[PDB]
Ligand binder design. Structure first.
Ligand code: FAD
Length: 504
């Protein structure tokens, strides 16, 4: 159906042919556009991954047209930049929808003098890092690691990486933005006002408008960085001491050092402790620091490598060792299905509890389960809980992520056994993670913490506060009042959209 919507589009798009940016299931390149940024393969066989149209705007005016026609005739929009949402909310809906796909809005301009950049929402962080590196090796931006993450989604939900302890989240370093609200107005920080500019910086911008471009602060980094890659046996009692110390110290060591820890089973079947890190400093200083503060890791100089910050990004994207061209960061032409959940840890997990936790990896097939620690101290502890809607600051030792990966047979029953393994691991940890409410991280989206009910239900707001206070805490109620002002008719809505107050 949707005749009135589709006809209104070709009419309102300034013509140089609108049918070029409008893909429908008949068009042979519709399947390729849909698949290319379906980033979690578990949704490849999803029956709700069936937009009736995909629109690829080339200018702001195409977004305004798609917006105007969409509210006029009641059809539903899913915004997609990089497509990396872990629940695939940018390309799935239970009701008929179209995708507004921002891939062709990916222009980047950099001002080295004032250490700032403009990035359009369809750019990946790989393209941004490439542009920054071609300008200076003393400039960084703390986005994530994986080079195909879209800046559209990432900067609207937080953005954690190897340099967050030094610089804060990607959202903490946004200084302006171009946002298109429900009325089709193109606003920036001055005209959108401070409440809305607060809300889009980690509150989930897609609840409030279509971010056209972000303006970011570029940060100063030393020209060379040191990484280490290290593997230890979890059965080694000295590494168990290291993990004991890590829980208490990784969030409190030098802000220039961020250490990630992961666990998976290998090979007759044992658990590996995976340890990786970036240090904004020299190798000699890295070895002195880690040996004084984490001696049970037994870090050896052969585990450490000095390189430029952008090269450290390229290495952690699994290129290199025999290094490829820097233009690697531009190749978005990038495979197992996965489910993940996460938790905030504020008190060290007791040793016996961590053992039982990790023992659950044996119950999944070898190497499929994965448990990771991402430390939160440093700058994250110097920023208030309401500076932006992201509230997990001081008092958080690390974010604990659970993940299970698999190859999809088509068999629902066997796919459900993996979902059931994660749920089991998450339920077991209930008494040892944050409580009231159990915290979760927006950019590690998880529908199992709760979803919206129907917007006409009388308890739509309170139901939304179930997941809403897990992502945001007391910042949720301020997001609701802001949503009421900028989107009173609730055009921007999905399974975990901030609700506006019911109209009086
Ligand atoms: C797939 C993935 C994700 C990922 C990661 C590695 C991989 C392989 N590593 C991450 C990391 O190290 N640190 C981190 O904090 N997150 C990491 N992620 C997750 C990823 O960064 C987030 O999921 C992010 O939101 C993804 O953004 P992207 O833009 O790529 O994804 P999307 O599906 O298209 O959109 C995400 C949500 O935001 C809304 N959206 C998208 N664009 C806009 C604009 N322009 N305006 C408003 N809302 C927008 C989508 O509708 C969706 O809800």
């Amino acid at each position: 159906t949707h005749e009135a919507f589709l006809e209104c589009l070709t009419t309102r798009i300034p013509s140089f042919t609108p049918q070029s940016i409008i893909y429908t299931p008949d068009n042979p390149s519709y399947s390729t556009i849909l698949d290319s940024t379906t980033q979690n393969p578990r949704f490849l066989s999803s029956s709700t991954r069936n937009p009736f149209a995909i629109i690829t705007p080339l200018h702001a005016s195409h977004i305004q047209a798609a917006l105007y026609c969409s509210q006029k005739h009641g059809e539903q929009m899913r915004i997609r930049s990089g497509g990396h949402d872990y629940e695939g909310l940018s390309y799935q809906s239970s009701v008929p929808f179209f995708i507004l796909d921002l891939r062709n809005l990916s222009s980047i301009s950099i001002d080295a003098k004032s250490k700032s950049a403009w990035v359009q929402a369809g750019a990946t962080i790989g393209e941004l890092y490439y542009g920054i590196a071609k300008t200076s090796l003393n400039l960084s931006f703390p986005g994530g690691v994986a080079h195909t993450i879209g800046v559209g989604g990432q900067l609207g939900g937080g953005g954690y990486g190897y340099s967050t302890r030094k610089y804060g989240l990607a959202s903490d370093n946004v200084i302006d933005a171009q946002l298109i609200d429900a009325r089709g107005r193109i606003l920036d920080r001055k005209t959108m006002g401070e409440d809305l500019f607060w809300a889009i910086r980690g509150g989930g911008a897609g609840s409030f408008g279509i971010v056209l471009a972000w303006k970011i602060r570029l940060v100063n980094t030393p020209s060379t960085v040191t990484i280490f890659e290290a593997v230890r046996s979890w059965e080694n009692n000295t590494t168990k001491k290291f993990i004991r110390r890590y829980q208490r110290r990784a969030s409190k060591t030098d802000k220039d050092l961020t250490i990630f820890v992961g666990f998976r089973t290998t090979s007759r079947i044992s658990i590996l402790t995976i340890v990786s890190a970036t240090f904004h400093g020299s190798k000699d200083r890295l070895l002195q620091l880690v040996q004084k503060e984490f001696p049970d890791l037994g870090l050896v100089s052969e585990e450490c490598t000095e390189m430029s910050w952008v090269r450290s990004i390229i290495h952690f994207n699994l290129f290199g060792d025999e290094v490829p061209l820097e233009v690697l960061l531009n190749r978005t032409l990038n495979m197992k299905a996965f489910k993940l959940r996460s938790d905030y840890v504020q008190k060290p997990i007791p040793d016996d509890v961590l053992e039982k936790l990790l023992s659950k990896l044996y119950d999944e097939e070898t190497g499929e389960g994965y448990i990771e620690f991402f430390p939160y101290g440093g700058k994250m502890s110097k920023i208030s809980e309401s500076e932006i809607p992201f509230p997990y600051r001081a008092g958080n030792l690390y974010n604990l992520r659970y993940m299970v990966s698999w190859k999809d047979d088509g068999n629902i029953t066997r796919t459900n056994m993996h979902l059931s393994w994660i749920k089991d691991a998450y339920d077991y940890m209930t008494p040892y993670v944050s409580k009231d409410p159990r915290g979760a991280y927006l950019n590690f989206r998880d529908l199992d913490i709760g979803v919206n009910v129907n917007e006409s239900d009388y308890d739509y707001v309170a139901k939304a506060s179930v997941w809403g206070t897990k992502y945001f805490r007391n910042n949720f109620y301020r997001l609701v009042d802001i949503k009421t002002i900028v989107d009173p008719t609730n055009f921007f809505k999905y399974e975990q959209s901030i609700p506006p107050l019911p109209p009086l």
